[PDB]
Design a binder for this molecule. Structure first.
Ligand code: GTP
Ligand code: MG
Lengths: 68, 7, 46, 106, 87, 451, 49, 78, 360
């Protein structure tokens, strides 16, 4: 995160784990692409990730609950 | 059917 | 407008009333006619 | 085994509530019915009171006396199931109440 | 006394509604009121109700025309309509 | 009498102050001790109970003091009027935090907890609560007797609550009561011949409202009972003259007003009055005095209370009758049931019927003959046929309520209230409001031919 | 009369024609109406045939 | 037989209610003397209290509480 | 001139006790020393709720909003709906009706709009599996509470529908003395309109702290799909200890707001459940006020009920003081005879009160 809140990690399992940097306590496992996510960005106040894969669609995800 | 009220 | 509203609520309450009381008379018909026929069944052999 | 309830011809029953208050058609077989608690068994059955005009004597928990009915035909509105008529309420005969000789005490 | 003024106000309402009872009826409690036995047009000011023969014409609203519009949207999207065929 | 705390009064004391009654000069509200013997349910020992004594109205108690009974028994005549934690809760001055701190916020529904981290340190192991985690007639008779014995057993406890402030003057104890606001005329005409009973009101019988009951003309009463015709009800404890109104659910669709009661069956009725429990019966009398007794039976109407509320709505029929003047085939022009274009514009679309029993519908206003308008029917109306518009005008009960208050009179009988309609008419020497066309006649059907 | 009284099944007298509208007398009731209407139906049916 | 018994044992059936009091201090049961006027009342009251306390009175009025037996009393009211 | 109160406290319970006893009430000084004083919006809506439920009840509010009068009337109920303000969820508006409810002329079908759950107030599975069973054992028979659609803070969109139609005369008198054995420990975990991983990692993270406990654990999952999810995303977890041998329940809750780990919230609710069963005996610390109101509003008997010592809090003191200054009923306290734990037993001579609204 740009305000070093937490880090998002993709997997080649079609998912992204949102994962704390202070605590690594596995905040979220947000998924739903069906072909591996291969770009991840985080909003400038750690509120909204933008995830994207080889399914040609980009998904804008609110971080308060991992919603879309 | 009602009689009361709030004032 | 008053005509349409009053005819609607009257049809709604009548369709409720018929089904509700026919429901209760049929359930109290069968849940005692069953044991009445079983009573005449057990009484017929004596 | 000698009767519809044990062996007795009559059994005191506690009236739960009047069945069929809200029937629109007067003198209808849903209207002239009432829930009654058999005491010597302790269970709830439903029973007739003839003449729904004199239904309104018996109201609620008034230890009525419960006799047999005996359908001697095939009446039209007559539902099956019930075979219990009410013969007294709280000690006094409700037939005598209907022809207004006696009085119901409370 | 307090009981005395109690009895005189009781006596007051006694008097007012005994003369109400013996006195003339309202027009609106007596049945069979013609036109000539009323206040002339008291009836708009009445809040009086009755029953009617048949449901009148449904006034066509924006919500009912858009409901049938989305109905025809669904139907002509799916092309599930019913025409005649040749022979 | 099994659900009401009642008491006959056998001894009476008008403990006012004589310098005070000489000071105001015969106007005071005489505070009175009533020395009596209570029966019924236990009397609630907190002073402030509504208690109705008969024939004056209901009061509230002010102080109550039980005495040793003057006519006791083996374990004899008596003729008066003749020859820690609990107090830590309930003491009022201190604050609940002081109560809990010397014993050791409720809009928030969840109970207050502490820091979750030390909670988890407490319940890392769970072994503390691990001990916790491992005929019908005589049936009801046994249940009620078991209730009575645990009642008496847990009444057998520490004295000052279960003997004078938590169970309340248990059953059958000679007590003294002090009322205030007793009017002077009770003491001024205190005849000891007439009894003075009293009974503690429930909370549900102090409020006034409208009671729906099911009446009956009493079977030895010689006269039918009119609507809006005053009679005195003996409902519960009170006796009051009120103005009943008799209704019938016409096939259980409505509650329409009658003019009298039926001759031999139960009919519904409504009246203003004090509230009471449902399923409670009452008698109801006509004229109670002794100047007007005759050889007539006095009890007028008996019956029980169906239910209660504060406002019922009852209607009555009224038939807007009209007259055709111009018929056609299957439609007609009708006249003077209405008077104005705005009236018929209100009543566009209403169903009507004829006295010949055929249906119809009032279609539209006629323009210039401002009363007259146009209606369509099943077939041809004759020129000699009155139309009918069934409608429901709502009537409402009158709020009249005199308790009889018999034992404040000068004479203690000859009580008067509202007289009956027939006798106020006879008193002001009027005549009954008859109607000449309303009277029936020996009708004469003639053999009507056809063309 | 099975379970009813004579005062339950007594009588209901019919009201007569008014005196205001008495020029065209004899208000006709439901039995008079059906007595007229079945005759009119008969005449219309034979006209149709 | 069972015939004369199985119909007469329903006299033991009722509505279950409660009677307000154990054997601690039952009250004087209120006994009322009602008749048409000019017969019975005061003389029957006098005779009953004379038998019940071996002592009559004169011009009795108001409710009078008189014992009757070692159990309980009662109360007379003309 | 009848019964008067100070302080903007305990307000729902004062109004429901006035409506039960039939006595009128003044309450003055509603947060008079405040920067924005007066009666709140949600409690004004609560009074309009009460006025829609009852009939003939009259209420005046101060123009300064710092006092409220209330003469009650009879309760009639009826099939209605109620929009609720977004300051306060539906548990706050359904909990006083949950014990005013079984006494009207008619049934109760009053469905509520708005937010389903919150932190401070009552969740809906909380209300169901922790306040239905105490009432079903007090004497009501058909009380039900369904969810048409859930909601979540702070956008809501939740629809909740209670019905009661066992209109009894009065509750029976409870006699519970022992320490009730727990027969099972169940619970449910719901998620409104987020991913379905949250529920399973709530359930396992909860049940890891009581897998060592011997008793049988059963937590049921429910996601909430589609339009029924409502208008805000959220999730929550409900734990209920069931005593089926006599039918009691304990319960503990939470919802998880933004920035909260579901594993940690699951074990947090399970540790608060352990907290409550430590502090509790035969009733929950939040099941307590409804229970003692029922035992004071039942029949003219002695109702006895056993509680452990830590139930007695400032809420208990203020509830007893309020119930005295409505209808002056002292509670006697029986210390149990085996007193290594000083367990009190509330015995109250109940009033012989009954509803007088029924069609009979
Ligand atoms: N013939 C006859 N007269 C009786 C009898 N008993 C009482 N009386 C008469 O009744 C008269 C009135 O006394 P009570 O009968 O006690 O009067 P009461 O019954 O109290 O009725 P009130 O005087 O109205 O209060 C007495 O003077 C007797 O003459 C009786 O048994 N036979
Ligand atoms: Mg005498």
């Amino acid at each position: 995160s740009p305000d070093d809140r937490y880090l998002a990690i993709s997997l080649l399992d079609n998912t992204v784990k949102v994962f704390f940097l202070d605590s690594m306590k596995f905040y979220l496992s947000l998924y739903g692409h069906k072909l591996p996510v291969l770009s991840i960005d985080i909003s400038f106040d750690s509120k909204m990730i933008i995830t994207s894969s080889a399914d040609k669609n980009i998904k804008i995800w609110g971080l308060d609950f991992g919603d879309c | 059917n009602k009689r009361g009220g709030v004032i | 407008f008053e005509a349409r509203q009053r005819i609607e609520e009257k049809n709604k309450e009548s369709s409720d009333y018929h089904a509700k009381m026919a429901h209760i008379v049929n359930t109290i018909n069968t849940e005692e006619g069953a044991e009445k026929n079983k009573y005449e069944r057990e009484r017929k052999l004596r | 085994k000698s009767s519809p309830f044990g062996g007795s011809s009559h059994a005191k029953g506690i009236v739960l509530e009047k069945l069929g208050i809200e029937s629109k058609q007067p003198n209808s077989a849903i209207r002239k019915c009432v829930r009654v608690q058999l005491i010597k068994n302790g269970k709830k059955v439903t029973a007739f009171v003839p003449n729904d005009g004199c239904l309104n004597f018996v109201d609620e928990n008034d230890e009525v006396l419960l006799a047999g009915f005996g359908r001697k035909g095939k009446a039209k509105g007559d539902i099956p199931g019930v075979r219990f008529k009410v013969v007294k309420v709280s000690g006094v005969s409700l037939l005598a109440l209907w022809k207004e000789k006696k009085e119901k005490p409370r | 006394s307090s009981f005395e003024k109690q009895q005189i106000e009781i006596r007051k309402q006694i008097e007012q509604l005994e003369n109400e009872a013996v006195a003339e009826k309202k027009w609106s409690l007596k049945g069979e009121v013609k036109a000539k036995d009323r206040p002339e047009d008291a009836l708009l000011t009445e809040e009086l109700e009755f029953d009617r023969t048949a449901k009148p014409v449904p006034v066509i609203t924006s919500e009912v025309t858009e409901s049938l519009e989305d109905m025809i949207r669904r139907r002509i999207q799916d092309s599930n309509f019913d025409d005649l065929q040749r022979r | 009498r099994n659900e009401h705390p009642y008491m006959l009064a056998d001894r009476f004391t008008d403990l006012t102050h004589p310098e005070l009654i000489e000071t105001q000069g015969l106007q005071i509200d005489r505070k009175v001790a009533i020395y009596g013997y209570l029966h019924g349910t236990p009397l609630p020992s907190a002073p402030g109970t509504r208690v109705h004594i008969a024939g004056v109205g209901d009061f509230s108690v002010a102080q109550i003091e039980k005495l040793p009974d003057p006519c006791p028994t083996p374990f004899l005549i008596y003729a008066p009027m003749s020859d820690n934690i609990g107090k830590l809760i309930y003491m009022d001055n201190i604050s609940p935090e002081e109560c809990i701190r010397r014993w050791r916020d409720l809009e928030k529904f969840v109970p207050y907890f502490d820091t979750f981290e030390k909670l988890a340190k407490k319940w890392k192991s769970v072994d503390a609560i691990k001990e916790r985690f491992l005929t019908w007639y005589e049936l009801q008779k046994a249940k009620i007797s078991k209730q009575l014995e645990i009642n008496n057993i847990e009444y057998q406890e520490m004295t000052p609550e279960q003997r004078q402030r938590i169970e309340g003057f248990k059953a059958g104890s000679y007590v003294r009561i002090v009322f205030e606001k007793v009017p002077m005329e009770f003491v001024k005409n205190f005849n000891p011949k007439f009894p003075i009973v009293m009974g503690g009101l429930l909370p549900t019988e102090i409020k006034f409202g409208i009671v729906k009951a099911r009446l009956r003309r009493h079977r030895w009463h010689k006269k039918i009972l009119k609507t809006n015709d005053p009679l005195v009800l003996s409902l519960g404890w009170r006796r009051f003259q009120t103005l009943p109104i008799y209704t019938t659910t016409d096939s259980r669709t409505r509650t329409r007003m009658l003019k009298y009661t039926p001759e031999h069956t139960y009919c519904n009725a409504a009246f203003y009055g004090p509230l009471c429990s449902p399923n409670t019966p009452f008698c109801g009398v006509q004229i109670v005095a002794n100047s007007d007794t005759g050889n007539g039976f006095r009890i007028a109407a008996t019956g029980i209370v169906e239910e209660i509320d504060v406002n019922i709505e009852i209607v009555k029929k009224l038939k807007l009758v009209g007259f055709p003047y111009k018929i056609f085939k299957n439609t007609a022009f009708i006249k003077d049931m209405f008077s104005s274009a705005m009236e018929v514009a209100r009543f566009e679309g209403a169903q009507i019927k004829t006295v010949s029993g055929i249906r119809g519908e009032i279609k539209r206003a006629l323009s210039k003959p401002e009363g007259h308008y146009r209606a369509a029917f099943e077939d041809k109306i004759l020129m000699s046929d009155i139309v009918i518009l069934r409608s429901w005008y709502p009537v409402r009960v009158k709020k009249f309520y005199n308790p009889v208050t018999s034992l404040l009179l000068k004479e203690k009988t000859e009580w008067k209230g509202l007289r009956l309609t027939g006798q106020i008419r006879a008193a002001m020497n009027l005549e009954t409001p008859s109607n000449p066309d309303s009277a029936y006649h020996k009708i004469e059907r003639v053999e009507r031919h056809f063309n | 009369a099975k379970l009813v009284h004579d005062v339950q099944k007594k009588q209901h007298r019919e009201r007569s024609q008014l005196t205001s509208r008495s020029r065209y007398g004899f208000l006709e009731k439901h039995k008079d109406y059906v007595k007229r209407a079945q005759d009119f139906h008969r005449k219309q049916s034979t006209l149709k045939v | 037989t069972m015939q004369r018994s199985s119909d007469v044992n329903e006299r033991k059936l009722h509505v279950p209610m409660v009677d307000r009091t154990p054997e601690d201090d039952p009250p004087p049961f209120i006994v009322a003397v009602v008749g048409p006027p000019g017969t019975g009342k005061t003389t029957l009251i006098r005779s009953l209290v004379r038998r019940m306390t071996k002592s009559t009175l004169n011009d009795i009025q108001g409710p009078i509480t008189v014992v009757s037996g070692k159990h309980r009393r009662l109360t007379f009211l003309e | 001139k009848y019964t008067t109160f100070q302080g903007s406290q305990n307000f729902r319970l004062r109004i429901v006790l006035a409506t039960l006893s039939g006595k009128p009430i003044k309450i003055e000084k509603i947060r008079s020393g405040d920067l924005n004083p007066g009666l709140k919006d949600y409690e004004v809506s609560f009074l309009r709720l009460i006025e829609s439920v009852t009939n003939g009840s009259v209420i005046e509010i101060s123009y300064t909003g710092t006092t409220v009068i209330y003469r009650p009337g009879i309760i009639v109920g009826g099939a209605s709906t109620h929009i609720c303000p977004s300051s306060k969820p539906v548990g706050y508006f359904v909990e006083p009706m949950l014990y005013l409810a079984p006494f009207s002329k008619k049934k109760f079908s009053i469905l509520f709009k708005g937010i389903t759950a919150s932190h401070n107030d009552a969740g809906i599975e909380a209300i169901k599996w922790g306040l239905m069973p105490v009432m079903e054992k007090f004497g009501v028979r058909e009380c039900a509470l369904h969810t048409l659609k859930r909601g979540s803070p702070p956008l809501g969109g939740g629809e909740v529908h209670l019905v009661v139609d066992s209109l009894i005369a009065q509750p029976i008198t409870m006699h519970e003395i022992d320490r009730p054995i727990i027969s099972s420990i169940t619970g449910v975990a719901y998620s409104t309109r987020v991913s379905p991983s949250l529920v399973n990692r709530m359930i396992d993270g909860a049940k890891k702290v009581l897998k060592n406990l011997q008793c049988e654990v059963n937590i049921t999952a429910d996601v909430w799909r589609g339009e029924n999810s409502g208008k805000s995303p959220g999730w929550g977890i409900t734990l209920v200890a069931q005593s089926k041998q006599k039918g009691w329940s304990y319960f503990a809750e939470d919802i998880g707001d933004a920035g909260s780990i579901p594993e940690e919230l699951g074990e947090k609710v399970a540790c608060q459940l352990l907290e409550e069963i430590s502090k509790s005996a035969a009733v929950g610390r939040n099941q307590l006020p409804l229970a003692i109101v029922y035992m004071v509003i039942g029949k003219e008997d002695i109702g006895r009920l056993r509680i452990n010592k830590e139930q007695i809090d400032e809420r208990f003191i203020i509830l007893l003081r309020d119930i005295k200054k409505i209808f002056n009923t002292e509670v006697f306290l029986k210390p149990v005879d085996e007193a290594d734990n000083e367990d009190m037993i509330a015995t109250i001579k109940g009033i012989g009160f009954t509803n007088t609204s029924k069609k009979i």
